[PDB]
């Protein structure tokens, strides 16, 4: 395009779509679980990924991931969620943060305790 074209029409500044709109700004949010279940993922995986449908404090309702082995969550669990999606679990766009509210950390977890809300042993 010519210099004139650019004077006439400028260049177009391009915007980013947030991938966590349910978050409505916030770094995290508090939720309550409406559903709690297992879901089988897409090819070429095969599992029973454990997730949770969650009623955010924004009125929004999203489904979240529950990370680790075993969990104590269920209908009516008060819960906290950070963003970040799971590749194979489409629709699931958020993660449940362990060791907060009625989300347990993981018993018997020594490595990466931080990412799993587990206190240090003695």
């Amino acid at each position: 395009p010519t210099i004139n074209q650019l004077v006439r029409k400028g260049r177009e500044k391009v915007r980013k779509k947030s991938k966590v709109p349910a978050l409505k700004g916030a770094p995290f949010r508090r939720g309550v679980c409406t559903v709690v279940r297992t879901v089988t993922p897409k090819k070429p995986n095969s599992a029973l990924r454990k997730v949770a449908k969650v009623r955010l404090t924004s009125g929004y309702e999203v489904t979240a991931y529950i990370p680790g082995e075993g969990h104590n969550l269920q209908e009516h669990s008060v819960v906290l969620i950070r963003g970040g999606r799971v590749k194979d679990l489409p629709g699931v766009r958020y993660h449940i943060v362990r060791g907060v509210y009625d989300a347990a950390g993981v018993k018997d977890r020594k490595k990466s305790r931080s990412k799993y809300g587990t206190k240090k042993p003695k």
Binding site: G31, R55, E75, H76
Partner: peptide, 10 residues
Amino acid sequence: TVXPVXPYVX
């Protein structure tokens, strides 16, 4: 937002 019997309302 509310539910079955929960005093939590979301």
